Structure formats: C-alpha cells, structure tokens
C-alpha cells in the first residue's frame, strides 16, 4: 500500500466533530457538517480538505432540501474523493443516524489515480476511529439511488433515507 | 505494478488468430473469435482462457443476433475479466473492423480483485502487440450502451456498431 500520506490535524478534527452528540447549543449544531469531501494533494502525500465542498446541517431546512441527492450531485466525474456523510434513516424500530465513510472512484477517473486513491485509503480510514460502515462507487447511476446507501446502513430492514422513501 | 504474471501460449494464439485476414476458407473463418474473455488463474500468476465464455462469428448470424449485448451479458458481477471483442461498425466513409481490448473491473467486485487485475493489466496488453483500441468499464449500464463502445473507436464519426444503430 501507501503509508506515505499524511491526514491534516484539521481533518481529523472535522471527523471527530461530526460525531459529535447534541451537548452544545443549537447553533455549532447547524453549523455542524452533514457531508463533507476529501481528496489527495498534488503530491498526493496529504489527505486534504477540500473547502466550499460541504452540506452544513443548516442548509437542510432551506438550501438544500434533499441532502443526499446534494452530496451526491457535488461528487466529480473525472476525480476521486473520500467524503464522510452523516446519515439520518429509518427502520421499523428506530429512527437512527450514523456516520458513512465513502471512497469515490468514477468510472472515468484516470486508473492511475484510481490506484493512488485506493492504496492511500487505509492511510485515512484507520485514523477515523470507529466508523463502521463504509461505501465504495464507481457508477454514478448507483450512488444517485438511495436504496445504495441505505442497503450498506442496515440492508432490508432500512425503510427510508433523509426523511425521503427508498 | 505486477509483471509477475505469464501469459499462456495458447492465450496469445487466440489473440493472433482473432486478428486475421480473411486469406483462408469460409469454415475456419465462421470458426473465427467474435469475443473472448480471460482471467487471472487463482493464484494470480497466469492469465488464462475462460472456456465457454465466448462468441464465435458463426453463432452471430444464427444463435446471436446482437453480438455486443451477448458480450456485455457474458461481463460477471463480482469479477473483473479482460476481454478480446473484434467489433463492426460504419462511418460515413467506410464499413471498418477493428479489435478491442477490454478492461472489465464491475462496482461490486472486491477491490482487492480490481488492483491485482488491473495491476496485471501490462502483462497481457504488452503481448497484444499492435492493439490500438482499449476500452475499461466500471459500470455495467454504461458498457450496455453501444455509444460507449463506438465513441471509442472512432468517437462521433461512427454510426452504427454491429449493424446497428447507436
């Protein structure tokens, strides 16, 4: 593999923050983030934030509307990416919500790069302590379809996405 | 990469007889290679000839029909394969025929699977001296399309592919 990509303290951070549980105010919640990208430095030594690129919470109720099918639509044809998307879904029992680590790889990408981004993914994943669940697309006509997601969470039993039927 | 990995005799035979010129009877020819897969052996040393998955020129005009769709319906789910596809296809100048290499790595495959093949990928492309044309495909509802294929051989100049229209 490649264990010679570093991941940025500010990274890390935006992970942690993600799982964070509804002790503080309702306003850094909101600010909090849905989903968020990263990708590979020129170099491709550092695993990167990669800024605008984001759903914050906030942006559901008003900009956004549906935020899966946003993060979806800010997932590049020509690049990879590692994007963690904190999912809300809903089973017959409960109404649960969890943290989704996803390797994007479009069929167009360069292969090289595909390659690079794939051997790094340990580099980042292993830093993300406890994450549990973990999506890898190449086909966009896939990841566009909820039940994709939904089927990784908790397969069957999974009943609806973001508030939105399967 | 992986250059530790031998391409079988026979496996480069068929290469060299699919790029033929129709010097020899109408039997031989009819018994001629419309497509063809090969896979890594299990462990992944040698690249070898997938027997019964194949298309044979003479099973188009009779048990075929659509020689591109049977293939596309040969790719497995869950294994990546490289293929041979002799493809016929028209511009507005000329009726040509032309022989593809095809890097076949499907979404749910491990991806474990897909670097070692596609690491492997050199060994075999290297033997098929003189190839011109490869095409790699993640997502199967791409592939299906005859677009796909013929933008790239020839992109928007070619009209139809197998007798039919794009």
Same mark, same amino acid.
């Given at each position: 593999?490649? *264990? ?8 890390? &951070?935006?992970?942690? @923050?993600?799982?964070? $549980?509804? *002790? ?5 919640? &909101? &600010? $909090? ?6 990708? =590979? *430095?020129?170099? #491709? #030594?550092?695993?990167? +934030? ?12 008003? /900009?956004?509307? @549906? ?7 800010? =997932?590049?044809?020509? @690049?990879? $990416? ?5 999912? /809300? ?9 969890? +943290? ?11 292969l090289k790069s595909k390659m690079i981004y794939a051997s790094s993914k340990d580099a980042i994943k292993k830093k =993300?302590t406890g994450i549990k669940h973990e999506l890898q697309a190449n086909c966009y006509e896939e990841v566009k379809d $909820?039940?994709?997601?939904?089927? &990784? ?14």
């Amino acid at each position: 593999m490649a *264990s010679g990509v570093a991941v940025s303290d500010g990274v890390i &951070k935006v992970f942690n @923050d993600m799982k964070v $549980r509804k *002790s503080s105010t309702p306003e850094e919640v &909101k &600010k $909090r983030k849905k989903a968020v990208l990263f990708c =590979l *430095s020129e170099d #491709k #030594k550092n695993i990167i +934030l990669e800024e605008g690129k984001e759903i914050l919470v906030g942006d559901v109720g008003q /900009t956004v509307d @549906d935020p899966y099918a946003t993060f979806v639509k800010m =997932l590049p044809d020509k @690049d990879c $990416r590692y994007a963690l998307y904190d999912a /809300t879904y809903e089973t017959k029992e409960s109404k649960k919500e969890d +943290l989704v680590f996803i390797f994007w790889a479009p069929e167009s990408a360069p292969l090289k790069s595909k390659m690079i981004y794939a051997s790094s993914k340990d580099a980042i994943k292993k830093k =993300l302590t406890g994450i549990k669940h973990e999506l890898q697309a190449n086909c966009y006509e896939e990841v566009k379809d $909820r039940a994709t997601l939904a089927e &990784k969470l908790g397969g069957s039993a999974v009943i609806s996405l973001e508030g939105k039927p399967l």
